[PDB]
């Protein structure tokens, strides 16, 4: 013998059913998973103080939009958030169901340098894992979502082999104890944007870095039907001074995903990684102006689908409608690039 | 650095369009390519000495059936039959030029015992292969074939590690020589029927070792779109005393490919392995009524196209005809089940 | 670029000098870092309640034992000792420094089941692993244990893959987190006796792992001049109703860790592993006699260093002086054993 | 199961015997092994045409060395050499045996580029490999040799992944194979000295490539007992206007060894490459100084064992006895620098 034991039907029925829900035809992923650090930096943008009231207001104004589940499939959560009410007094929860939104949870515990690396990083979180998944199960989650980093700098070397293996290692593991527990995991193998590489540069290692993780998948006896894939688009680095364009974008991202993810994995939903939101709706676009695709190609964005929405909140509670107005505006960009009908807003080997 | 230099888009374009002519819809391979000893076998069962008069005679007999090319994009070739004549005089490739059949050929040099394994198989031919590929293109080989070999036997732990490991690494060294030479690859890590395992336990077995080929594939810069799969299909072991239902076949099998083959790979052209010409064709036939599929699913048979016509011809050359004839209704039986519209002849996690 | 930066040449060389000083000639480890669960069947042995007050009795009973250094270069000790005092309101610590034993300290978070394995386990206790060591350093520890578990069982193919992997990758993370907070890792991959397996069974798997193990090391730049290693000693199973012979266990030992131990490993600290006491001495001193070695054979001991001390003990106070002697006959037993010494008490390829 | 069938012990010991025969102290290999090409660059350096008279009365000239055997524990072979007879009539192989030198054959194909590398190289030859072996046996080779070649070029991220994987591969195989047919296979994995890279960078590729090589020594079942390594020194590039020192040189070289060198292995046989005749003797001299070690550290030099011989020789028939004379001086001062008493002649972590 020495095969992985036959996974529960019913555990993997219910994880591949979800997974299908979350990559549904016209919907994507809203990313409000902000951990208390990174939602002080976006709140810093708008000048508002990261307070608790502050946050569940925001968080509020988010899944408390009208139609919000017209686009979107379902909203990771930051743990504070599942166990929050809304300024009214509604579970956070409750927001999302009465959208019909599933709701997700964040389970890594962030990143921690792998030691004598040029800080490359290792996600932390496996301690206890299983056990807050059961717990997040319970609170109402069916989807999770876990944090990899990966930087490119061909002059160090980077990503060097130990932080392939690292990552790869720690999705694999992650993923596995998600779908023993019940929750669809969300495998987030970002490559950062840093840098002045060439797209065909950041093609190669997003190619070298997938083919690890879905072998590591594999060993660990992950489902690919009842998971999900959060990976970086194929970009120029962020110093270039020439952003890409679409189609370039477009084709040498789809190509990377051909060419390592097999396509028994139900849905891609990009990471938007710094990107404006109007390049965000476009290059997704633009992938599935190629389609049909063996996957679908959609989104999972936090910036992208918020950064207007903070912009037009500016902690100020009168400005909620139309916070939540752009925010619409936003999500169905991103539902309508999800079918490759979105008109635009305000091969190689 | 230290990635893969960039292929030649030449190199590349051609290896690319040549996969996909090879993967044609509605055709599939003629395998051809028995060396002596195995076409000894085959000539054996049906009373016939192997001399290179009557492998000669054989082998127009099949390249010469007219319409053929309907049905049949390519055919393995050994190295003699690359080389060699028809008694009437014509050269074999010209046969299949007539046809528009693509000539390949068999570039492995056979097995050879692993050593302080129970039997288990390395396959040799690397050493001048390099040089043989550009001799075989030069003779109007346009895909190459290499074939190992891998045993189930849970009680014995075969396939064991340096099975997998041997294998995945002559495939992939075997691909990117080829690739060099500008000739299409087919992959062919062929798991034995030997044993009396379940259909599942071929399935786990099928997983890992794809898994292990397509990230050796990878390492070593193989372009997938210019190269093919022929991988056993999924089934009971050959001891088993019931062979599994077309439907159960056509499942695992599915989900074994989708499950580690990534999409960027054009063809996924089946060895028939033992199965009667019919299971063969009935098989493909139930896969392909699943369809739409992310590659072709096709044939690339050699007894499952040959069995009836040998049995025809009995080594008597009057019998031409009517061998080329059963030929002709099996490579449409085949080319029709790859469309999955074959009406025959004479989810699990 | 892209390998591992420069460690400290000031870090490495504590860490190597206390290394060196753990592994000392004539000395061993006193493994006394059972977590609250299991010194609660220890103490199940000799009927004791598992009290705070007769856990701080056992501990103080063990490390005030006058003249205990002369044998115990270090001991290991469970987190509440580390931060514990005797009964009479001495520091754990300074009972250990008196002695000039070094304080060691075991960081790991236990066992949790791989998902999709029959039982095979996964040791945790990355999370905070690294603010813990400074703590813990500060505190007096200069040396770090992590258990780490595999199970034969050719019938299920254990230790799988994924065992053997996740175990080796768990011990690499935590050496290097150790060094690179100034603490000595004790890397700890057991190989359970638990099965009818023969000794041969038992030293290729113990090659096995070892092989992955030391790997795994180099490839996240552990520094073996630096760590050691308590592996156990090669052995029939524990079922098996022949104990084998001294000789025999010295000898494929040996064999095993000279097959795969680099010798910039200065020592091999055996467990006891369910080894009656005496077998333990006799099996080291064996080994030793077959010096000399190309790293320090000694010893890491809890139970074969122990049981008789418990027995001794009974619970009752007035025996704390008969323990303590029944410790230091033990603790003599082993340290002559590390010398190849030890009169005794009361070439296969 | 699934492990290794147990090696032969009558095999075993043969080859384990031989390769500590080969391994004596004070004694080293003398690699007269060239290629037909090879020798023509060694005999254009004294303006000599290679033809094979010339190439037979030059390897009569080494081998009947009167007294040669006294430093000289065996004498790697070319293939023509192993069937070669002297000018006078004498086979090679017998000039061998009177000095009681173990007769040894090269075995490899030679290299070839891997594709889509920069020109980064594997080393060929396993086709009949198996066969070669027993032939050799026969005529009289009782141990191997396989060069495999590595480059360093940090900007150029050599040697790359798949230069290694590929190295460690064809090593592990082509051991094994030896090892089945009773030849003690010498590992030579050579990291080239071409390049500026400082003489640490060499440290950190060598033991990368090393803890790789063994790892997968290990996977195909290699008998370290009757195996030798033949691995370049660590040194400065050949481009670095400052030859390091010979006690850095030992330093680094004895380090990288220990980091990954089981001690199993009987011995190491260090090539030359390219180092002058006194600098090759002073270096291993230097590391014997720091003896004892766990393996032996010896010789097994081309260029450092024939380059005044070769100069001293100029073809001149009548200078046979003087160029005889020079090879016993270097001999002399090579089987000294093993036991760490050659005068000289004409802790980082």
Redesign the interface.
């Known amino acids: 013998?020495?095969?992985?034991?036959?996974?529960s039907?019913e555990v993997?029925?219910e994880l591949?059913e979800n997974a299908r829900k979350i990559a549904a035809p016209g919907k994507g992923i809203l990313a409000a998973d902000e951990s208390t650090g990174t939602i002080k930096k976006r709140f810093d943008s708008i000048g508002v103080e990261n307070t608790e009231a502050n946050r569940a207001f925001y968080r509020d104004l988010l899944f408390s939009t009208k139609g919000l589940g017209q686009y979107i499939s379902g909203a990771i959560l930051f743990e504070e958030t599942l166990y929050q009410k809304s300024p009214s007094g509604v579970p956070m929860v409750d927001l999302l169901k009465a959208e019909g939104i599933i709701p997700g949870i964040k389970v890594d515990?962030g990143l921690?340098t792998?030691?004598?690396?040029?800080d490359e990083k290792?996600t932390?979180?496996?301690?206890?894992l299983?056990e807050r998944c059961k717990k997040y199960y319970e609170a109402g989650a069916r989807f999770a979502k876990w944090r990899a980093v990966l930087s490119i700098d061909?002059?160090?070397?980077?990503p060097?082999?130990?932080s392939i293996?690292?990552v790869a290692?720690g999705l694999a593991?992650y993923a596995?104890?998600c779908?023993?527990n019940r929750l669809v995991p969300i495998v987030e193998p970002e490559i950062l944007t840093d840098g002045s590489h060439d797209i065909?540069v950041c093609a190669?290692?997003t190619?070298?870095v997938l083919?690890?993780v879905?072998?590591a998948l594999?060993?660990?006896?992950v489902?690919?039907?009842?998971a999900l894939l959060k990976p970086n688009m194929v970009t120029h680095g962020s110093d270039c001074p020439k952003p890409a364009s679409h189609e370039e974008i477009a084709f040498y991202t789809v190509?990377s995903l051909?060419?390592?993810?097999?396509?028994?994995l139900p849905g891609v939903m990009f990471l938007s990684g710094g990107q404006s939101e109007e390049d965000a709706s476009l290059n997704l676009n633009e992938m599935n102006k190629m389609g049909p695709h063996?996957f679908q190609l959609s989104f999972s964005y936090g910036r992208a689908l918020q950064a207007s929405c903070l912009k037009a909140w500016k902690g100020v509670p009168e400005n909620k409608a139309k916070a939540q107005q752009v925010l619409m505006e936003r999500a169905r960009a991103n539902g309508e690039a999800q079918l490759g009908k979105y008109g635009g807003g305000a091969?190689?080997?």
Chains 1, 2, 3, 4 share one sequence.
């Open positions: 013998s020495g095969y992985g034991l036959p996974i039907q993997a029925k591949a515990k921690e792998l030691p004598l690396t040029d290792a932390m979180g496996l301690d206890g299983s061909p002059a160090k070397g980077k060097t082999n130990l293996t690292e290692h593991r596995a104890i779908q023993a065909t190669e290692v190619e070298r083919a690890a879905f072998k594999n060993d660990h006896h489902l690919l039907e009842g190509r051909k060419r390592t993810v097999p396509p028994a063996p091969y190689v080997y």
